[PDB]
């Protein structure tokens, strides 16, 4: 499967007219472009080596679109303030996520268009790309207004055409990078926990992509409950880290095994505590 998403944020600043606007583009969950109005010279910038292939025309067009989005978000932020009867001053946020998912057949599988106000669902385009889903009363106002304008058709055309077109291009351009894997480097640590009990922590480091599965087994059985799994976190160099631990009776560490599953592993790893 594959995907492309553009995550945009506009933040109202007390004592300022233009909001802070930030847009980040992703291909298969990897950041590849970015725009920030707070920069000295607001411009879309490459964030993946394979984007240096795009000519000056590409950046020019993208940067213009951003300038447009800034104004759209600015006017919209103003409107919502009235819809919710919020006092002037204060800071508010408007976000948007748009994009498309391709299936195994590399053909369109689904388009997305969602807006959030104050970090909460506002209005979203349904999978049919024709109808809107409003999360609350204020959003119903926007929905009713957009049903009249055929706003959905506009977005539908981008999600089935342009989105699809560029995702294929980026996939073709950044292929050697996007499709690569860095299989995990794993090991098991041993730590004191309490009276007659110790912790075994199974680490998985420097892997890519982020998706991964770690499990613990006692006597051939899975330890879903009793297993503490941290949230996957970035190493900061493009790769990820994760660990899973279990508390065990001191003197039985050897009865436990950790398994690591990852796309870069044709066969899962099997680790044990090693004194």
């Amino acid at each position: 499967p594959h995907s492309m998403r553009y995550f945009e944020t506009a933040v109202s600043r007390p004592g300022l007219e233009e909001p802070r606007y930030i847009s980040v583009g992703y291909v298969d969950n990897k950041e590849f472009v970015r725009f920030d109005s707070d920069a000295e010279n607001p411009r879309y910038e490459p964030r993946a080596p394979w984007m240096e292939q795009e000519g000056p025309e590409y950046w020019e067009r993208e940067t213009q679109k951003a300038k447009g989005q800034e104004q759209w978000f600015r006017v919209s932020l103003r409107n919502l303030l009235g819809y919710y009867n919020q006092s002037a001053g204060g800071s508010h946020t408007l976000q948007q996520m748009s994009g498309c998912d391709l299936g195994s057949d590399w053909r369109l599988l689904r388009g997305y268009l969602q807006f959030a106000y104050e970090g909460r669902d506002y209005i979203a385009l349904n999978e049919d790309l024709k109808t809107w889903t409003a999360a609350d009363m204020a959003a119903q106002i926007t929905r009713r207004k957009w049903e009249q304008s055929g706003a959905a058709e506009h977005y539908k055309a981008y999600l089935e055409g342009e989105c699809v077109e560029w995702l294929h291009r980026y996939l073709k351009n950044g292929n050697a990078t996007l499709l690569r894997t860095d299989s995990p480097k794993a090991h098991v640590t041993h730590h004191p926990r309490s009276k007659g009990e110790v912790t075994l922590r199974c680490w998985a480091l420097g892997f890519y992509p982020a998706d991964i599965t770690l499990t613990w087994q006692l006597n051939g059985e899975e330890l879903t409950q009793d297993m503490e799994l941290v949230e996957t976190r970035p190493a900061g160099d493009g790769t990820f880290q994760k660990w899973a631990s279990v508390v065990v009776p001191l003197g039985k560490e050897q009865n436990y095994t950790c398994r690591v599953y990852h796309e870069g592993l044709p066969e899962p790893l099997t680790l044990r505590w090693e004194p």
Partner: peptide, 11 residues
């Protein structure tokens, strides 16, 4: 390539 929200279609 990002989407462009219709100019006359704000929230």
């Amino acid at each position: 390539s990002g989407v462009e929200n219709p100019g006359g279609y704000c929230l």
